[PDB]
Amino acid sequence: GVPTYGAIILDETLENVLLVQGYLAKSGWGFPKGKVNKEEAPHDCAAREVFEETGFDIKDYICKDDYIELRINDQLARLYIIPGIPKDTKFNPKTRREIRNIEWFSIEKLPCHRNDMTPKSKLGLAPNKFFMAIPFIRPLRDWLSRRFG
Ligand SMILES: OCc1ccnc(NC2CCCCCC2)n1
């Protein structure tokens, strides 16, 4: 898969993160990201995708070493960590055709896994609208503990 780049934007309290909601197969909440273009540097892709999806330009705030990266089904996703963005920031996507809504969420209230269906003696996982975000949550929490305590 083509690598994806984007951002985990946090507010000034470090207790909220900015998620975006897509449509259709992307109908749930996830961090802003997208696919890298040919010859495009990771930081430039992250800023481009984040600005397309949120209308906020991270370019001046990216730190090269501050990111969480996961490989999910052999596609790499790297989200640069951007703390300290005020919650009164006006966010507006560039394309309403891809982004339904943009909201802040409490990090402590977000799930870090989906629930099984062991009460129903059935295999698999119950739907969760944070499914896109979930893989990053525990790594984010651990990262913020290490960097800030
Ligand atoms: O959060 C990690 C992740 C994994 C898989 N898909 C996505 N898609 C995001 C960008 C596209 C438009 C809104 C939905 C979120 N995010």
mmCIF file of C-alpha atoms and ligand atoms in Angstrom:
data_model
loop_
_atom_site.group_PDB
_atom_site.id
_atom_site.type_symbol
_atom_site.label_atom_id
_atom_site.label_comp_id
_atom_site.label_asym_id
_atom_site.label_seq_id
_atom_site.Cartn_x
_atom_site.Cartn_y
_atom_site.Cartn_z
ATOM 1 C CA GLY A 1 0.000 0.000 0.000
ATOM 2 C CA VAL A 2 1.088 3.613 -0.614
ATOM 3 C CA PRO A 3 2.267 5.168 2.783
ATOM 4 C CA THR A 4 -0.071 7.652 4.489
ATOM 5 C CA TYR A 5 0.859 10.714 6.490
ATOM 6 C CA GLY A 6 -1.136 13.013 8.680
ATOM 7 C CA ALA A 7 -1.368 14.399 12.231
ATOM 8 C CA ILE A 8 -2.526 14.003 15.745
ATOM 9 C CA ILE A 9 -3.435 17.510 16.769
ATOM 10 C CA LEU A 10 -3.868 18.150 20.477
ATOM 11 C CA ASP A 11 -5.111 21.232 22.285
ATOM 12 C CA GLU A 12 -3.278 23.227 24.851
ATOM 13 C CA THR A 13 -4.396 21.072 27.749
ATOM 14 C CA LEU A 14 -3.137 17.873 26.088
ATOM 15 C CA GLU A 15 -6.419 16.187 26.973
ATOM 16 C CA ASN A 16 -8.210 16.622 23.626
ATOM 17 C CA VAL A 17 -7.454 15.433 20.100
ATOM 18 C CA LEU A 18 -8.829 16.538 16.752
ATOM 19 C CA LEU A 19 -10.613 13.914 14.782
ATOM 20 C CA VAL A 20 -12.337 14.063 11.360
ATOM 21 C CA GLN A 21 -15.312 12.112 10.143
ATOM 22 C CA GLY A 22 -15.468 10.845 6.557
ATOM 23 C CA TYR A 23 -18.153 9.277 4.441
ATOM 24 C CA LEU A 24 -19.089 5.801 3.223
ATOM 25 C CA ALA A 25 -16.236 3.352 3.896
ATOM 26 C CA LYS A 26 -14.655 6.158 5.905
ATOM 27 C CA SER A 27 -17.923 7.010 7.683
ATOM 28 C CA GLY A 28 -16.424 7.027 11.266
ATOM 29 C CA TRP A 29 -13.867 9.225 13.086
ATOM 30 C CA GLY A 30 -10.147 9.081 12.368
ATOM 31 C CA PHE A 31 -7.086 11.261 12.423
ATOM 32 C CA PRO A 32 -6.546 13.436 9.359
ATOM 33 C CA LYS A 33 -4.219 11.702 6.918
ATOM 34 C CA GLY A 34 -3.853 10.567 3.334
ATOM 35 C CA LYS A 35 -1.728 9.010 0.677
ATOM 36 C CA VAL A 36 1.690 10.317 -0.272
ATOM 37 C CA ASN A 37 2.142 11.704 -3.817
ATOM 38 C CA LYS A 38 5.124 10.773 -6.059
ATOM 39 C CA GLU A 39 8.343 12.606 -4.979
ATOM 40 C CA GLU A 40 6.499 14.035 -1.905
ATOM 41 C CA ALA A 41 8.387 14.299 1.370
ATOM 42 C CA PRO A 42 6.497 12.785 4.472
ATOM 43 C CA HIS A 43 6.193 16.178 6.231
ATOM 44 C CA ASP A 44 4.799 17.809 3.103
ATOM 45 C CA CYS A 45 2.205 15.048 2.593
ATOM 46 C CA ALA A 46 1.116 15.343 6.273
ATOM 47 C CA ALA A 47 0.693 19.045 6.018
ATOM 48 C CA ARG A 48 -1.117 18.840 2.694
ATOM 49 C CA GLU A 49 -3.546 16.168 3.822
ATOM 50 C CA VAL A 50 -4.196 17.887 7.138
ATOM 51 C CA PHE A 51 -4.799 21.238 5.476
ATOM 52 C CA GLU A 52 -7.196 19.595 2.912
ATOM 53 C CA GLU A 53 -9.111 17.841 5.677
ATOM 54 C CA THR A 54 -9.145 20.504 8.373
ATOM 55 C CA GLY A 55 -8.105 23.834 6.879
ATOM 56 C CA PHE A 56 -5.359 24.123 9.463
ATOM 57 C CA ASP A 57 -1.737 24.370 8.307
ATOM 58 C CA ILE A 58 0.670 22.381 10.488
ATOM 59 C CA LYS A 59 3.729 23.029 8.461
ATOM 60 C CA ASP A 60 5.357 25.512 10.938
ATOM 61 C CA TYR A 61 4.600 23.132 13.865
ATOM 62 C CA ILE A 62 5.760 19.753 12.671
ATOM 63 C CA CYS A 63 8.584 18.176 14.588
ATOM 64 C CA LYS A 64 10.475 15.664 12.549
ATOM 65 C CA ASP A 65 11.016 13.146 15.317
ATOM 66 C CA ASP A 66 7.589 13.453 16.989
ATOM 67 C CA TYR A 67 5.187 10.994 15.335
ATOM 68 C CA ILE A 68 3.472 7.621 15.806
ATOM 69 C CA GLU A 69 3.762 5.188 13.020
ATOM 70 C CA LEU A 70 1.852 1.951 12.566
ATOM 71 C CA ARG A 71 1.856 -0.631 9.805
ATOM 72 C CA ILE A 72 -1.579 -1.969 9.333
ATOM 73 C CA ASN A 73 -2.069 -4.706 6.738
ATOM 74 C CA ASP A 74 1.189 -3.797 5.207
ATOM 75 C CA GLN A 75 0.393 -0.026 4.779
ATOM 76 C CA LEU A 76 2.384 2.398 6.849
ATOM 77 C CA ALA A 77 0.586 5.311 8.546
ATOM 78 C CA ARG A 78 2.631 8.014 10.174
ATOM 79 C CA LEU A 79 0.914 10.713 12.200
ATOM 80 C CA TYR A 80 2.965 13.640 13.345
ATOM 81 C CA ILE A 81 2.179 14.820 16.854
ATOM 82 C CA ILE A 82 1.105 18.548 16.991
ATOM 83 C CA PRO A 83 0.324 19.682 20.574
ATOM 84 C CA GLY A 84 -0.843 23.014 21.766
ATOM 85 C CA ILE A 85 -3.364 23.967 19.120
ATOM 86 C CA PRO A 86 -6.103 26.145 20.727
ATOM 87 C CA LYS A 87 -9.543 24.688 20.923
ATOM 88 C CA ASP A 88 -11.054 27.812 19.523
ATOM 89 C CA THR A 89 -9.243 27.297 16.217
ATOM 90 C CA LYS A 90 -11.575 27.483 13.214
ATOM 91 C CA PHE A 91 -11.299 24.362 11.264
ATOM 92 C CA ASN A 92 -12.925 23.987 7.875
ATOM 93 C CA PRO A 93 -12.205 21.285 5.377
ATOM 94 C CA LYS A 94 -11.375 22.093 1.840
ATOM 95 C CA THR A 95 -13.724 19.413 0.455
ATOM 96 C CA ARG A 96 -17.109 18.832 2.023
ATOM 97 C CA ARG A 97 -17.285 15.822 -0.350
ATOM 98 C CA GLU A 98 -14.803 13.899 1.787
ATOM 99 C CA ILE A 99 -15.184 15.287 5.329
ATOM 100 C CA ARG A 100 -18.480 15.310 7.165
ATOM 101 C CA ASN A 101 -17.424 16.915 10.396
ATOM 102 C CA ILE A 102 -14.360 17.834 12.496
ATOM 103 C CA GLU A 103 -14.478 17.698 16.324
ATOM 104 C CA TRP A 104 -12.371 17.638 19.414
ATOM 105 C CA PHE A 105 -12.519 14.475 21.554
ATOM 106 C CA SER A 106 -11.370 13.803 25.057
ATOM 107 C CA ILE A 107 -8.409 11.411 24.842
ATOM 108 C CA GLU A 108 -9.285 9.683 28.096
ATOM 109 C CA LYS A 109 -12.797 8.915 26.825
ATOM 110 C CA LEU A 110 -11.700 7.419 23.461
ATOM 111 C CA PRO A 111 -11.525 3.687 23.193
ATOM 112 C CA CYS A 112 -8.164 2.004 22.771
ATOM 113 C CA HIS A 113 -9.780 -1.299 21.441
ATOM 114 C CA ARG A 114 -13.158 -2.437 20.145
ATOM 115 C CA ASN A 115 -15.372 -4.647 22.308
ATOM 116 C CA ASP A 116 -15.746 -8.325 21.544
ATOM 117 C CA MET A 117 -19.199 -10.053 21.473
ATOM 118 C CA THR A 118 -18.365 -12.718 24.145
ATOM 119 C CA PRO A 119 -21.800 -11.977 25.748
ATOM 120 C CA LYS A 120 -23.401 -13.228 22.482
ATOM 121 C CA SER A 121 -20.975 -16.279 22.137
ATOM 122 C CA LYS A 122 -20.158 -14.809 18.710
ATOM 123 C CA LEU A 123 -16.645 -14.143 17.186
ATOM 124 C CA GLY A 124 -15.388 -10.786 16.076
ATOM 125 C CA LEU A 125 -15.719 -7.230 17.231
ATOM 126 C CA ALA A 126 -18.676 -4.865 17.790
ATOM 127 C CA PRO A 127 -18.762 -1.831 15.457
ATOM 128 C CA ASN A 128 -17.196 1.287 16.879
ATOM 129 C CA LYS A 129 -17.257 4.646 15.183
ATOM 130 C CA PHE A 130 -13.677 5.315 16.301
ATOM 131 C CA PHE A 131 -12.330 2.260 14.488
ATOM 132 C CA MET A 132 -9.921 4.349 12.313
ATOM 133 C CA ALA A 133 -8.477 6.141 15.381
ATOM 134 C CA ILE A 134 -8.339 3.251 17.823
ATOM 135 C CA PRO A 135 -4.982 1.735 16.788
ATOM 136 C CA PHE A 136 -3.236 4.994 17.590
ATOM 137 C CA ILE A 137 -4.772 5.637 21.007
ATOM 138 C CA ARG A 138 -2.621 3.483 23.270
ATOM 139 C CA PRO A 139 0.573 4.469 21.445
ATOM 140 C CA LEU A 140 -0.500 8.143 21.817
ATOM 141 C CA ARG A 141 -1.179 7.837 25.485
ATOM 142 C CA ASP A 142 2.233 6.149 26.017
ATOM 143 C CA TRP A 143 3.978 8.737 23.944
ATOM 144 C CA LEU A 144 2.395 11.629 25.852
ATOM 145 C CA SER A 145 3.354 9.932 29.229
ATOM 146 C CA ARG A 146 6.952 9.607 28.138
ATOM 147 C CA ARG A 147 7.242 13.197 26.736
ATOM 148 C CA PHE A 148 5.148 15.036 29.394
ATOM 149 C CA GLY A 149 4.347 12.690 32.369
HETATM 150 O O1 LIG B 1 -6.969 7.471 11.784
HETATM 151 C C1 LIG B 1 -6.230 6.586 10.969
HETATM 152 C C2 LIG B 1 -6.991 6.194 9.727
HETATM 153 C C3 LIG B 1 -7.028 4.905 9.229
HETATM 154 C C4 LIG B 1 -7.762 4.682 8.087
HETATM 155 N N1 LIG B 1 -8.444 5.660 7.461
HETATM 156 C C5 LIG B 1 -8.366 6.898 8.015
HETATM 157 N N2 LIG B 1 -9.036 7.904 7.423
HETATM 158 C C6 LIG B 1 -9.005 9.300 7.881
HETATM 159 C C7 LIG B 1 -8.829 10.264 6.706
HETATM 160 C C8 LIG B 1 -9.886 10.249 5.623
HETATM 161 C C9 LIG B 1 -11.119 11.094 5.855
HETATM 162 C C10 LIG B 1 -11.744 11.014 7.230
HETATM 163 C C11 LIG B 1 -11.539 9.722 7.983
HETATM 164 C C12 LIG B 1 -10.231 9.597 8.742
HETATM 165 N N3 LIG B 1 -7.666 7.188 9.136
#
